[PDB]
Amino acid sequence: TNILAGAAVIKVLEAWGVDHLYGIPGGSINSIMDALSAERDRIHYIQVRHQEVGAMAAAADAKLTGKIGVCFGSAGPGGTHLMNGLYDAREDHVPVLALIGQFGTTGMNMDTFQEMNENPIYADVADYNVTAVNAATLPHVIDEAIRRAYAHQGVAVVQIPVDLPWQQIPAEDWYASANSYQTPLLPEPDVQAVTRLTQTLLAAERPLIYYGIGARKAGKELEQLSKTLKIPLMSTYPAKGIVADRYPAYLGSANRVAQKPANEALAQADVVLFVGNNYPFAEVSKAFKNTRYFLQIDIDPAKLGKRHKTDIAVLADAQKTLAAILAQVSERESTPWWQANLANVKNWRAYLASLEDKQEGPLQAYQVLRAVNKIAEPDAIYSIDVGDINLNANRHLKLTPSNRHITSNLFATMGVGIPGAIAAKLNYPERQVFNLAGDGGASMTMQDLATQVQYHLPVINVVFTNCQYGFIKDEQEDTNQNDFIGVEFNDIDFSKIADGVHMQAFRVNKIEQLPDVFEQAKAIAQHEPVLIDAVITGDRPLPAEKLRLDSAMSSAADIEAFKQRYEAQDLQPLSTYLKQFGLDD
Amino acid sequence: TNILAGAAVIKVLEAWGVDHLYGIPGGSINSIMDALSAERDRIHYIQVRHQEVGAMAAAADAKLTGKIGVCFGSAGPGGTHLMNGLYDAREDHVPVLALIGQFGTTGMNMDTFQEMNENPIYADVADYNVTAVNAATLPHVIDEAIRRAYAHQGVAVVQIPVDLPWQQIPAEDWYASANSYQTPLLPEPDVQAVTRLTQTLLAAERPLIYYGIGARKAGKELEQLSKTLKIPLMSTYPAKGIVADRYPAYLGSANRVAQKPANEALAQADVVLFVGNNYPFAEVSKAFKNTRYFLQIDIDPAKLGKRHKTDIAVLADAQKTLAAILAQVSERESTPWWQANLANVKNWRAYLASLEDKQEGPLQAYQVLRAVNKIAEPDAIYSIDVGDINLNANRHLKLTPSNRHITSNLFATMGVGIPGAIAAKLNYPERQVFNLAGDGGASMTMQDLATQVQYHLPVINVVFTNCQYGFIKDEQEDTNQNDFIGVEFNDIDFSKIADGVHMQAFRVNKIEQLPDVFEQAKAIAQHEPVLIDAVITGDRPLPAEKLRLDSAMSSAADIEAFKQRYEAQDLQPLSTYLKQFGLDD
Amino acid sequence: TNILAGAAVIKVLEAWGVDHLYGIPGGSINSIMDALSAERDRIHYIQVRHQEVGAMAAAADAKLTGKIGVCFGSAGPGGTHLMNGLYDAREDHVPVLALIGQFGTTGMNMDTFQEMNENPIYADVADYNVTAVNAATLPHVIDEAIRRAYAHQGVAVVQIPVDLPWQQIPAEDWYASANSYQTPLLPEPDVQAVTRLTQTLLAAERPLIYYGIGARKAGKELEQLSKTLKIPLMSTYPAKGIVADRYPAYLGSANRVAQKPANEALAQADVVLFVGNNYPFAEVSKAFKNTRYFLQIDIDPAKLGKRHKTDIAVLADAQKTLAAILAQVSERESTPWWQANLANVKNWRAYLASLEDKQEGPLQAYQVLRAVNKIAEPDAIYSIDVGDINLNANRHLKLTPSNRHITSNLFATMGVGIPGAIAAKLNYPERQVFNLAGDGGASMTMQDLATQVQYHLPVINVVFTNCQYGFIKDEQEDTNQNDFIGVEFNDIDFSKIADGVHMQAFRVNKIEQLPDVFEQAKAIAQHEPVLIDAVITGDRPLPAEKLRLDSAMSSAADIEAFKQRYEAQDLQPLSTYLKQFGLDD
Numbered sequence A, B, C: 001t002n003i004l005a006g007a008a009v010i011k012v013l014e015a016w017g018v019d020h021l022y023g024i025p026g027g028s029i030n031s032i033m034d035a036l037s038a039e040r041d042r043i044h045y046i047q048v049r050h051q052e053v054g055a056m057a058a059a060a061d062a063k064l065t066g067k068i069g070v071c072f073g074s075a076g077p078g079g080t081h082l083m084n085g086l087y088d089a090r091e092d093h094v095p096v097l098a099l100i101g102q103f104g105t106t107g108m109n110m111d112t113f114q115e116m117n118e119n120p121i122y123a124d125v126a127d128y129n130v131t132a133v134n135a136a137t138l139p140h141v142i143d144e145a146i147r148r149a150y151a152h153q154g155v156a157v158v159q160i161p162v163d164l165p166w167q168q169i170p171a172e173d174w175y176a177s178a179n180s181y182q183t184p185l186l187p188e189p190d191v192q193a194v195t196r197l198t199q200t201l202l203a204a205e206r207p208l209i210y211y212g213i214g215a216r217k218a219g220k221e222l223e224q225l226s227k228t229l230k231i232p233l234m235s236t237y238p239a240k241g242i243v244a245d246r247y248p249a250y251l252g253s254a255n256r257v258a259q260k261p262a263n264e265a266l267a268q269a270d271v272v273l274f275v276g277n278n279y280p281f282a283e284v285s286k287a288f289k290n291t292r293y294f295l296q297i298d299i300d301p302a303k304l305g306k307r308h309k310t311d312i313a314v315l316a317d318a319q320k321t322l323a324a325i326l327a328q329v330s331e332r333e334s335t336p337w338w339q340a341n342l343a344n345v346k347n348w349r350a351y352l353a354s355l356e357d358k359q360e361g362p363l364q365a366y367q368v369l370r371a372v373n374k375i376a377e378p379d380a381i382y383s384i385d386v387g388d389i390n391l392n393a394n395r396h397l398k399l400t401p402s403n404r405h406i407t408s409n410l411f412a413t414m415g416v417g418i419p420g421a422i423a424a425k426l427n428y429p430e431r432q433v434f435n436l437a438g439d440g441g442a443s444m445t446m447q448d449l450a451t452q453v454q455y456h457l458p459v460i461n462v463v464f465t466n467c468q469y470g471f472i473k474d475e476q477e478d479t480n481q482n483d484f485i486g487v488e489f490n491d492i493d494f495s496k497i498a499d500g501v502h503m504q505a506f507r508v509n510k511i512e513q514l515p516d517v518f519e520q521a522k523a524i525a526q527h528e529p530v531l532i533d534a535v536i537t538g539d540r541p542l543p544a545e546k547l548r549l550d551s552a553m554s555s556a557a558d559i560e561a562f563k564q565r566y567e568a569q570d571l572q573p574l575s576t577y578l579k580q581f582g583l584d585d
């Protein structure tokens, strides 16, 4: 006749297909804990060592599977620790439910221990943000939170006074609306608009197709359009892998977490097809300053004309639209623009390979990443932290449509490497999972290496130990007048940290050590997590946004210094290739 | 060459097709004022007498036309006065841009005169809420605010430091994205779900179709489905008029701003098709406690299964889905359920007509509304305030698809009568416009009667003067132990208020006075606004939510008392008609 | 035994001595209404016609008496209407309790009618901002709100789910802490700091004492210090009347709501004693750019050195410190600086008298204010709206320590005239009360003229009808490139508005009409409210911040034009008087 309200809440989560959720208990959330305890055979609580890791892992769950991620924190400090993960979910627009403990309704507003008005804490981050005040409606409030988080692709937060989940409510009244769930309708491309878009693209002298993760279902179409029309491809960094990196007309991404060919080509392009893309550097970097026509395809009206004025804007699904373009075009001959870009890409890839292929000497990030490539399965998943690793992984990982990679794309919170890998291994136990992290980022969430151990999650953790916030040191080099500050720090031996949490580990500092250590790690990670602490040099990775290679633009001295510092003696500027094929820069 | 940033901002508004905008100047917004002053031919500034009326009028603009409404207020108190209209826009989910003055950037954060951090003021109400800090990006920020308000169907607020719009910016850089704006092309309604939904509806013994304003494009289909299938129609109050009130199987709305036949039928129905509907009383009133199967059609995933456990919920457009159902069904013969409902409606309408058709004696609301109907053009627009007028207008106005009516549907702010009528006449100068308001609500925004005069907007204002907050008095009668309080007050003669603002007006207190006064008003309003102050009795309108007519449910004494108080001697309960056609209650 | 929680709440208000409170009922606050209804003998509920007037009146109660003001609004729009008065209370740092209705706990978070999370609405304005969730603790939460509002001199807001006040709670448990309330006993002003401050002040060649309302208890000391030491006095505008306006060495206030002698002297002064003063124009106007030494006395550490670099800042009570200074000084002979200032003041007052003393012709603000002075009792209270009236009243009213005057000092919300006068008459039924308001501000709250009638509050309302937002028109003249906009509008006849609310009234447009109309009004207001609508010219009042009188600073042409426009042919610049008594400018 009755059910505990907390039991009904857990049943709502189960109806919505939640397999696992993260948090740390406290008195103020012990009645939800009690309900979880009874349901342990049907829904799986993962106890993390810091609640930020639970929030980041919930966000990562949703990034990976599209299923709402679920986390919780106890009253006060338990919940405020969630923040970096909740802001990640908001900014990366993925559904997350966060439950926050609160004192019982009989003590709220008494200024009792750790008791505060918690609702204003979450107002900014959350799409939906409510304090529950009744047990009978609590299942509905949770259901509402989930349904809104999905519909609005963001964070729903419910503060739950601890007395409510221990109250009996009528067993027959509550329900979940999971049964009724659907994903948003996919809008269709207007036929005439797409024909006009196609005509403009085909009349271009120096076209590019520039896609983001909105085109994640359209890899086949992107690559075929590129091949058929002889139009190079470039992407946002997160969209790496949608088209295989091997594809010879894939230029990479622009700006800083970027590849040289993409920056150079974008500056020359006359027509850009911007599809499923919300590149946040568009305006501030003047990326499209010299673009003649700008063609946009996006499913979200809020994005149409956002990043540059459009000449044709199509409010439609990327794959449907790109398919419709492909269906109305035929094979075109090579052009000078096409060949200049192909040559530039080959030159760039030879540079990257030269860095990877060193066989002995002081270890650099580049060889560590080659060693990752050498042990990587074709459907591996990469959880990447924030810093130089985004830049280096973007250049060196050899991804295909079978891979996934995630980071904190826009909020760019450090520390996500560890939680993202925890989430990945929970969702895909049979796929290989890497955590690629700098030392600064790994430090921030290091304690949750213990969580990988506790749940026997066989992540391959690779820490890039430069004893620096390298990404920031380079920024200070670029902007600051006075000496470096806060960017070089003491060593932490992550192989000893790993030992401390009872994880097998290695530390390496020479290129020649890589093959055997990575082979051992590959094997250990058939059953248990492992960590490789790669002590790397302080070499700055080549700044794709600050090239000094073209004599029409840089002094011979600056060019020589750039080539020496970046081992870039064999890199040519795009203008070399433009000139070979008869085009002006 | 250069342009003032303020001039560019006004050009962004013009690009988006903003015809008119409302506000009151102040030093802190005088640079936007300056830009408006140069653009009088292309954009029409309406100076209101209180900023809440500007905000409510902006919301009403969007309710009526679907185009973003625009309002502003000066720093501090100018902007906080907008709140009731901004919350109306949020809750009625219509796009509104609000500009808020702010001190110049050189004095912000100095604690100078009327200078405060204004951003937190608007955080709750707004979908987008930013303080501008640069002139060159100001046109983009306004463009972004508009594009988000439309995309997210809510309020965008921009706080503008007064120095920025007077700064020169490059003439060639700014743009508006109005040219990208479009509406989505949707796929066909999900074929197999619609077919299954149809079977469940047709199998029902006591079906109802219960629609809201999400079905605004589907009036034809709703009426044809009803006629063909012999299924009565009911609606939310705001959806009155989508199907003509005359339609014999239109039951009205449920709850309190409601009609008897709808409440009675809903309690008996076995299957409800809930279409384009977010009825907020669903759960609290247990409206669907008896319903066996609950079927839904809605465009928004956030609504699927929201208001009741839903057997089939189709994510689709209402009109397309209802047309798809109509295309797969055909004539059903009249059923007892159909005939019982027809009879019940006829009885109810006879009751309402008996109230309307009194010819002499103390004036009641009922005859005032009959007099409105007698002078109303077939495409009249009605701006309705908040209180008993919603209840009475819902019962008595004879609307068709050619009419529009608006109120504050969900936030339910009093005072909207006046601003809604201002907005209606500005958008539709050739259509007759009424403002129907209680004395309490008309009092709140009375000063803006002067705005109708100043802009020669020929609104027909009808004030229902009962010297009460009648809607609240009746609530106190129902719930309060102690004497009435705050609900009966001293007369205001609105004909004298009208005279004070130089508007022609009349005061009436007898039924026999109505025809000549309403004829005069109809004629005056060919050229100028007019006000009729109708002094009405304190009679409580029949409570459709507290019927005492069925001898199986209520004592003879209770029924006799109800019939006496509400002049309802000839009303029969639905059970009488159910029994007449051979159905149990 | 038990008590209704609402009844206990009202007993908490009574314990704290709340005489009267303002608001408008609604379903969502009807349980508090019910408790008020049983307690009419002990607490007096004032039903206003717009909730902003309730909030502004609550703030004014606290401004006048130092006792917490209390207001309420129903859920949603009832409460958001409070905002302009709540922000006034925050910015004028006076204690106010605001109660906000909310849906019952069983329907919160169901998205039911007018139900929303109300807590974020009030977060910015409020010192304390909570949603009650339990009946038994509700009296404590109200008690806490009051105690914090007083302690922190600001707004406490409590959102009350309507079910709670109708629940029984144990009669013996609740209490109020009013019995604990007291004011602190402070140590002596810091002896050595006061002695040093005194030496610096006395060593000055061109000293000024510049006080604000923190010196409200120190009028006697200020005047005696000035007389004994031959140091002129100037004040903030709100501190007008602390020293009688008649005092020959009272210079007035600085900036725009200002008097010529204060602006001129401040620019020359070498030492300023800044007492109980938080003048918000200090930095933006560079008021103290020439000042050699800046001395401060303030009670609040947050103010020490805030407005200018301060040589000596004494943390102490103003009256005690000024008395301590007086006790260690003695007579100084008249100085040239003193004599120059006396002469300057005399010249200025002759100018103002020349404006006042016109006997016939087109009515200006100046003569209306003379007529006010002629009927004013010596202990009159003035509620002043926002606009030119601040400027004109500051110049023309002849105040003494027996008067009070209030406006919205810092938030500067228009519309406060009416509510401030309502509050004044409720607190002081035996004192004469004026509401001095511009037409724009009176328009905003005009409906609450009916509240004066309903409660028989004999306010003398004087509306200055220029058919402009004059204060803003003059700003546009000064800053705007393009034509005036939004600042000139259509007449409202407030004598007819008054007739509509059943208040006796007069409209005048000629100087010679004033004496008889003001005498009639004075007599009417022995028993009932009255309104005088004074139709005044559009003449710009002399801008004290833009003087053109000194031939060393301004061209002869500029001076001739200034003298012509402002009827200022006989005003002399301060330099004339400085030279007369042998000082350089």
Ligand SMILES: Cc1cc2nc3c(=O)[nH]c(=O)nc-3n(C[C@H](O)[C@H](O)[C@H](O)COP(=O)(O)OP(=O)(O)OC[C@H]3O[C@@H](n4cnc5c(N)ncnc54)[C@H](O)[C@@H]3O)c2cc1C
Pocket: A092, A211, A212, A213, A214, A215, A235, A236, A237, A238, A239, A253, A254, A255, A256, A257, A258, A275, A276, A277, A278, A279, A280, A297, A298, A299, A300, A303, A316, A317, A318, A319, A386, A387, A390, A407, A408, A409, A410, A412
């Ligand atoms: C340290 C760091 C540095 C970085 N720097 C760079 C950098 O230098 N260069 C770089 O490229 N990135 C960089 N990023 C990432 C960057 O911040 C942005 O997140 C990224 O550029 C945006 O990628 P996106 O447009 O693919 O994704 P999103 O911003 O998520 O946009 C997706 C777009 O697709 C649309 N969409 C979604 N579904 C569909 C559909 N079915 N059809 C059509 N449209 C659809 C959406 O409406 C949206 O507009 C960095 C990240 C980190 C952590």
Ligand SMILES: Cc1cc2nc3c(=O)[nH]c(=O)nc-3n(C[C@H](O)[C@H](O)[C@H](O)COP(=O)(O)OP(=O)(O)OC[C@H]3O[C@@H](n4cnc5c(N)ncnc54)[C@H](O)[C@@H]3O)c2cc1C
Pocket: B092, B211, B212, B213, B214, B215, B235, B236, B237, B238, B239, B253, B254, B255, B256, B257, B258, B275, B276, B277, B278, B279, B280, B297, B298, B299, B300, B303, B316, B317, B318, B319, B386, B387, B390, B407, B408, B409, B410, B412, C113, C114
């Ligand atoms: C004083 C007062 C009292 C009131 N009391 C009552 C009352 O007793 N009874 C009553 O009925 N109303 C009442 N109301 C109104 C009530 O508060 C709600 O606003 C109303 O019932 C909801 O109407 P709705 O569902 O039509 O509109 P909305 O709440 O706006 O919902 C529209 C729905 O349609 C969907 N939709 C939109 N477009 C489409 C599309 N193209 N296809 C499909 N779906 C779509 C939306 O997603 C949404 O779910 C009152 C109003 C006032 C002022």
Ligand SMILES: Cc1cc2nc3c(=O)[nH]c(=O)nc-3n(C[C@H](O)[C@H](O)[C@H](O)COP(=O)(O)OP(=O)(O)OC[C@H]3O[C@@H](n4cnc5c(N)ncnc54)[C@H](O)[C@@H]3O)c2cc1C
Pocket: B113, B114, C092, C211, C212, C213, C214, C215, C235, C236, C237, C238, C239, C253, C254, C255, C256, C257, C258, C275, C276, C277, C278, C279, C280, C297, C298, C299, C300, C303, C316, C317, C318, C319, C386, C387, C390, C407, C408, C409, C410, C412
């Ligand atoms: C339309 C309009 C225009 C205006 N323009 C002007 C203008 O041009 N000129 C002008 O002068 N005003 C003007 N004002 C008012 C202005 O905004 C400020 O409110 C005012 O100048 C500040 O006055 P104050 O310092 O007396 O009061 P507050 O700002 O309230 O400061 C009081 C100070 O006294 C201190 N204090 C309190 N008690 C004690 C104690 N016992 N002992 C010692 N210190 C104590 C406080 O800590 C505080 O620092 C205008 C108002 C309006 C409505």
Ligand SMILES: Cc1ncc(C[n+]2csc(CCOP(=O)(O)OP(=O)(O)O)c2C)c(N)n1
Pocket: A385, A386, A387, A388, A389, A412, A413, A414, A415, A437, A438, A439, A440, A441, A442, A464, A466, A468, A469, A470, A471, A472
């Ligand atoms: C939590 C957090 N703090 C600070 C930053 C700013 N930030 C971005 S990159 C970076 C340096 C990352 O250092 P590390 O993880 O060591 O990577 P490296 O660049 O040295 O390989 C910092 C501090 C951030 N994004 N997130």
Ligand SMILES: Cc1ncc(C[n+]2csc(CCOP(=O)(O)OP(=O)(O)O)c2C)c(N)n1
Pocket: B385, B386, B387, B388, B389, B412, B413, B414, B415, B437, B438, B439, B440, B441, B442, B464, B466, B468, B469, B470, B471, B472, C024, C025, C026, C027, C074, C077, C078, C081
């Ligand atoms: C601004 C605002 N304040 C209060 C309410 C609560 N409320 C809803 S109906 C009503 C009474 C309306 O009175 P009136 O306009 O005179 O209409 P009547 O019911 O007397 O016809 C009130 C106070 C509200 N919705 N909006």
Ligand SMILES: Cc1ncc(C[n+]2csc(CCOP(=O)(O)OP(=O)(O)O)c2C)c(N)n1
Pocket: B024, B025, B026, B027, B074, B077, B078, B081, C385, C386, C387, C388, C389, C412, C413, C414, C415, C437, C438, C439, C440, C441, C442, C464, C466, C468, C469, C470, C471, C472
């Ligand atoms: C509610 C509000 N809106 C706008 C302002 C900005 N403002 C300050 S003075 C003023 C004009 C006041 O006009 P009126 O009351 O007619 O006085 P006048 O200057 O004409 O005598 C305005 C709009 C304000 N302070 N408060």
Ligand SMILES: [K+]
Pocket: A050, A443, A444, A445, A446, A447
């Ligand atoms: K940590």
Ligand SMILES: [K+]
Pocket: B050, B443, B444, B445, B446, B447, C050, C443, C444, C445, C446, C447
């Ligand atoms: K008003």
Ligand SMILES: [Mg+2]
Pocket: A438, A439, A440, A464, A465, A466, A467, A468, A469, A470
């Ligand atoms: Mg590092």
Ligand SMILES: [Mg+2]
Pocket: B438, B439, B440, B464, B465, B466, B467, B468, B469, B470
């Ligand atoms: Mg009324």
Ligand SMILES: [Mg+2]
Pocket: C438, C439, C440, C464, C465, C466, C467, C468, C469, C470
């Ligand atoms: Mg005026």
